[PDB]
Design a protein around this nucleic acid. Sequence first.
DNA 1: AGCCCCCTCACAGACGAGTGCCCCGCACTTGGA
DNA 2: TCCAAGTGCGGGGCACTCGTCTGTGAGGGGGCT
Lengths: 285, 401, 49, 372
Amino acid sequence: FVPESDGYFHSAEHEGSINAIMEEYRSYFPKWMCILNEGFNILLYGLGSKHQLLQSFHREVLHKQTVLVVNGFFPSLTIKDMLDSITSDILDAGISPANPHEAVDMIEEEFALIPETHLFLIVHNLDGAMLRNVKAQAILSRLARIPNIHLLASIDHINTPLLWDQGKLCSFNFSWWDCTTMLPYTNETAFENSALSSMRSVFSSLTTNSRGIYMLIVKYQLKNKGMPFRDLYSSCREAFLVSSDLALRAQLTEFLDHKLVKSKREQLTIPIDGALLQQFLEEQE
Amino acid sequence: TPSQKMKKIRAGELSPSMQQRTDLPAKDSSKSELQLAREQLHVSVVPKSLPCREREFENIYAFLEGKIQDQCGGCMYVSGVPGTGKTATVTGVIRTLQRMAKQNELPAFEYLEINGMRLTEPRQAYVQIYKQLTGKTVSWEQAHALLEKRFTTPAPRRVTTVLLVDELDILCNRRQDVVYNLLDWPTKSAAKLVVVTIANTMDLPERLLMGKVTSRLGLTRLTFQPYSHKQLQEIVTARLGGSETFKGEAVQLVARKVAAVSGDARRALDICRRATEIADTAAVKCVTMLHVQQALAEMIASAKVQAIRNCSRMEQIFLQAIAAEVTRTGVEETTFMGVYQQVETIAAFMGVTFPPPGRALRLCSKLGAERLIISEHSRNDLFQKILLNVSADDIHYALRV
Amino acid sequence: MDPTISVSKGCFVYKNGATRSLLGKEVVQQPFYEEYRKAWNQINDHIAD
Amino acid sequence: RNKYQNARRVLNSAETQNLPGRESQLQELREFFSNHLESQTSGSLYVSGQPGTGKTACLSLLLRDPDFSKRLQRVYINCTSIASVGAVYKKLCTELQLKVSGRTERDHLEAIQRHLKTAKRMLLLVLDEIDQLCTSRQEVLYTIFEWPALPGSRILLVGIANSLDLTDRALMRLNARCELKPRLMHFPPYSKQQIVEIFKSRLAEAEVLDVFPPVTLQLLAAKVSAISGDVRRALDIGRRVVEIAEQQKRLKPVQVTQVAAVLNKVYFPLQQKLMLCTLVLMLRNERNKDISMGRLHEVYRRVCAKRNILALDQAEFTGTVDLVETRGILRIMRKKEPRLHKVLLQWDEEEVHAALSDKQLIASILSDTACL
DNA sequence: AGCCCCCTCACAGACGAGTGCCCCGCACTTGGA
DNA sequence: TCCAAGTGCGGGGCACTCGTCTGTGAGGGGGCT
Ligand SMILES: Nc1ncnc2c1ncn2[C@@H]1O[C@H](COP(=O)(O)OP(=O)(O)OP(=O)(O)O)[C@@H](O)[C@H]1O
Ligand SMILES: Nc1ncnc2c1ncn2[C@@H]1O[C@H](COP(=O)(O)OP(=O)(O)OP(=O)(O)O)[C@@H](O)[C@H]1O
Ligand SMILES: [Mg+2]
Ligand SMILES: [Mg+2]
């Protein structure tokens, strides 16, 4: 694969073959144990989802050793959680310090004392949501350097080695394996990292004065094709919809919090078109 | 020793005493009539019945007597600008109810009081209420757990406990759990809590409280309007009594000048004491119009023209040049460079030579410490910003005349 | 989807007797592992020297 | 004693037994609990509604039934009484009489997770005001709402809240699993006839029906159910009418005029008048709405110099504007130095003209535009 | 006949108050010695 | 008579958070040789 520069400047049998691919990838596991014994780490860079392959390697091979599975595709994990887990849940030595490099020095000092206690860790999506900074990769490269800690990891993004320098690439003693499955990304995309009906549903929950205020805003929006606060205030005080200014301001605050009115300093624009708003207006006749 | 002193202070077993005077305090016979009018005009001396606060007194008294004789609990919100007889009327109502409950005219009750502006955090309210229940100081989580065990569970015979909450707006934080817990316990049937909250702003339930808190707070509000010209004369003429020390026009001018600014009663009761202290030094026994006008000039003071008259020569040249630079370049926020250029022009006009900018920065710092101008740190010399804090006509009134 | 993947935890501990060679007797007694270890120790000591 | 104090005592806005308005929502909750007790499966539930509509009343009427008390173990937890968001697990142990080693929240969480798998009775957990458990990453709410998906568990939980879209904004990840999505239930606001039926239950419970004719109750309900819709304000105004009529008249039943006066009730110094006059003048005769305190003071000084009125200093003018701020006419945006504070008028000019009631003065200031 | 030069507008950054949270010291202290 | 280490709790460092504020990169709009 050699990319060209010009494009930048001018701008069933499938299941049986997938199970055959998975069995041919499951034939690699004692070779992976012999590679992991000699100081290397394992990196997978295929196309499909490699969650089931690492789960099968954990189940069928490492069913007795210490294992720290790290879901790197989780959108709200931290380095403090992983380091506190290694400090307090494996070593039973209290919470790790708040500065993470001192925690890595602590983990190195407590792992130097205990040989033949091999800790495995299986990072699904080493380039995940909260692992894309350089500090997390520096901490992971300091953790993978220890002769007891062994590392398996997955890679999914295309710009992943842009944040590994030669120090982080000589610390990570990687062995690049091509485990290209064809399974879809069903676990990595279900998290938080990846209208009219809501308007009708919220509008069916408001009271009658909120209905009158929102219909006044809708009528002004469909007449002038954003309204200031004083015109809405006079149009609501003429029809006895509000008592004072703070009642209308609380109604508009509830409108901003339920995402039906957009206020910009104080003009009030409903972020929809005229056709859906016209059919919404004739829906209440 | 620390240990037994802390264990006897936290348990509430030693009296928190204060030292006594060696010389015994003075007598009432040794005080003159001007001294008697000076001690009777103090803000600390609350009368046994408040003039011009009768309608609100009957309102709070009817509300609290109904809530005590019904044994049901509830909530009230009174509000008003500071100095208009809120806390005095509420504690007068509570003293009247306690005297009625002593004579077996009313069912008995307990009276708890907290103030939000003497608490370090709002959760210490839980430490204080419990301290008015038992006497023992605990942590706030244990006091909150014990208050929730006390109020939510039924235990006859439970006595009604009226809780007064002064300065409610300090108990409001980002989470608003303390005010929610205080306004939530009357809504239970086993807790006979009648909470009356006092605040300054009239729109406190709509401005910063959440929806459930302003729903629980109720709609039986009360507003203390400020004192007018006529009531603020009646207050002082009821304070002074039948003495002829204050003339009528003196009290009339004091009430007219105070009731046109704010409507505070503390302002009038301090201006009258200052007028008494002025008339003490003139070797007279009556307070005429002149001492009242002098006290009105001294208490309501405006000394940003005398401060410009009492500056040095180069600081007056500096103020003239800041005013001229504001006049020239239109916008008020000036830079020190154009100010120093107009300084050099004005100093070339008047003939006196000006110091270099190493001393003009000292002049600008001296005017900024005196708050005649508003200037930055002097670390960015010749590029610091200057606002004129005094009015541009005050300089022309202070230097021409 | 799986009971291993959750919506709260990010890390999962499988600690088995942790306190404070991966291959067993099958591979170490085989001759190719001993000759590989001997040759690698020789070459590593030579490059270190 | 008499019937006025009896109506005042029986309205009282506190916990009841008979709920005449919630007749279908209670049946829906009972059908949910029966279908989750019969087949012995776990499930979440999220009830939401405006403050004052009857969520805690329904879920406290259900938590005192004897058949559910003998079939399941129920726990009620209010989420505003806890110390912090991460401490609620400890409170669960206090509500379950568990045995933890203590002094850390993770051991409390593991003790709850051990108790949920080996329980002998089905656990119902009611979390009231669950919007106090919302945080930045929300590990506690996602941990709590995941326990139905735990293997071998039997916990079913009900979260009470005011926000309609709390579980769609702050609980998005639970949409990714069809087992873990909590079933919704929105308590609608009360109409007019439901508030009338609530009043007809509360008054005829203690035989105090004679003080309220239906006309005043119809007018009161037609105003309250239109303005806000909650029943706390309805009962509070219905108590305030009697509390006003007892002091006014002293049997005499209330008329339409008294309830109309109560509903239209619930729904100046010289220098402050001059400050409001110069602010209305500066907002009329100038386009941009940024008015500082120094510019307002400099206009007010010329206005006082033309009227031969002794003007105030800036240090007293700031206190005067801060005292007009308490009425609600203004709002002060705060800056570093007190000359720079921004004064925002938050009324209409006709409301200021009606509130001042000094027409010969306020018409003379707004025509005197020479000071600006 | 696709290209050359301004407009402008919500991200980028800062920043600044400001406010809540979590680690950390530290006396309590107590059942035990 | 004392005491070792849990522990309960206050206090400060820190990190988020809401609002303000200002450059600005590239999509967009008006003219071009
Ligand atoms: N109507 C009155 N009659 C007699 N004295 C009064 C009257 N009103 C106020 N005072 C005096 O002025 C003082 C006002 O105290 P008050 O209880 O009104 O403070 P407050 O309004 O609670 O203050 P804040 O609003 O700042 O909390 C009292 O000490 C009282 O002596
Ligand atoms: N259908 C009804 N019939 C009679 N009384 C009712 C009814 N619904 C509610 N109430 C009364 O309203 C009062 C408050 O209702 P409740 O506390 O259930 O509202 P809530 O939803 O819990 O409010 P929040 O959301 O603010 O906590 C109760 O004391 C109850 O007596
Ligand atoms: Mg007070
Ligand atoms: Mg409730």
